[PDB]
Amino acid sequence: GWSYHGEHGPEHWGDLKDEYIMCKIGKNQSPVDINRIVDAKLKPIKIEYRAGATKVLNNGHTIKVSYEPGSYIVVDGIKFELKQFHFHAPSEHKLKGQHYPFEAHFVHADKHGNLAVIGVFFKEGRENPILEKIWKVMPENAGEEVKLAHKINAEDLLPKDRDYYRYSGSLTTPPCSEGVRWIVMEEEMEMSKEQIEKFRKIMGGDTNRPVQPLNARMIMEK
């Protein structure tokens, strides 16, 4: 019964269930304000994506797009399979104290269940032609799920400059499990103001967890 507003909101997430305890005691939580940055010789990240987005689900907390097996990234010489991507507005991560109006998360998992999430910022700009295909068909109520007519390639929502920030964090929604590899891309993408407004309107407001303390962590920059 968790939410982004009111008494089941982010500050109370850890109180709600035993399984959500990391939202309360965790010291490596996401998102964060990216303001303690260090240059590091990170390897480039192999992105082996095919066209494979199939369904669009409104779950009350976001719009989630599911992906068929076969698409993956390689981080630390390990294959993490793309499972789904979804959205928040405004951005969950901040960059040196500032938000973007929107952020996408591409959620991946290796064979043992370890999670790697690619985060992509979006600013106000040209209509995103890939997001229009999903937005046209966006379910208006929680629980609804539409099948997509044409399969979408998620690689088209990623920038061509693939320099990125890296850090060790968590899921941004309960249970907020830790041990998540975060790959936040430096280069932003574009969306129309209308697309942003539609997403906010349908979600009913802000869909962003507050930034959490960096604590012992640093953010690595390629």
Residues within the interface to Ca ion (CB under 5 A): 39, 163, 188, 221
Asked whether residue 155 is marked as a ligand-binding residue, the answer is: no
Interacting positions 52-111 with Zn ion (CB under 5 A): 105
Query: Is 39 or 140 the residue whose CB approaches a second copy more closely?
Result: 39
98 makes contact, choosing from a second copy, Ca ion, Zn ion, none, with CB < 5 to 8 Å by partner type, with a second copy
Asked whether residue 188 is marked as a ligand-binding residue, the answer is: yes
CB of 177 to Zn ion, least distance (A): 13
The residue whose Cβ lies closest to Zn ion is: 105
Asked whether residue 194 is marked as a ligand-binding residue, the answer is: no
Positions in the binding site for a second copy (CB under 8 A): 39, 96-98, 161, 163, 187
Asked whether residue 145 is marked as a ligand-binding residue, the answer is: no
61, 108, 112, 150: which one is catalytic?
61
Known active-site residue 61: yes
Q: Is the peptide bond before 44 cis (omega within 30 degrees of 0)?
A: no
Asked whether residue 163 is marked as a ligand-binding residue, the answer is: yes
DSSP the chain: ---SSGGGSGGGHHHH-GGGTHHHH-SS-S--EE-SEEE--PPPPEEE--EEEEEEEE-SS-EEEEE-TT-EEEETTEEEEEEEEEEESS-SSEETTB--SEEEEEEEE-TT--EEEEEEEEEE-S--HHHHHHHTT--SSTT-EEEEEEEEEGGGGS-SS--EEEEEEE-SSTT--EEEEEEEESS-EEE-HHHHHHHHHHHTS---PPP---TT--EEE-
CB of 151 to a second copy, least distance (A): 27
Residues marked active site are found at 61
Q: Which residues are annotated as a binding site?
A: 39, 86, 88, 92, 105, 161, 163, 186-188, 221
Residues that bind Zn ion (CB under 5 A): 105, 172
Q: Which residues are annotated as a binding site for Zn(2+)?
A: 86, 88, 92, 105
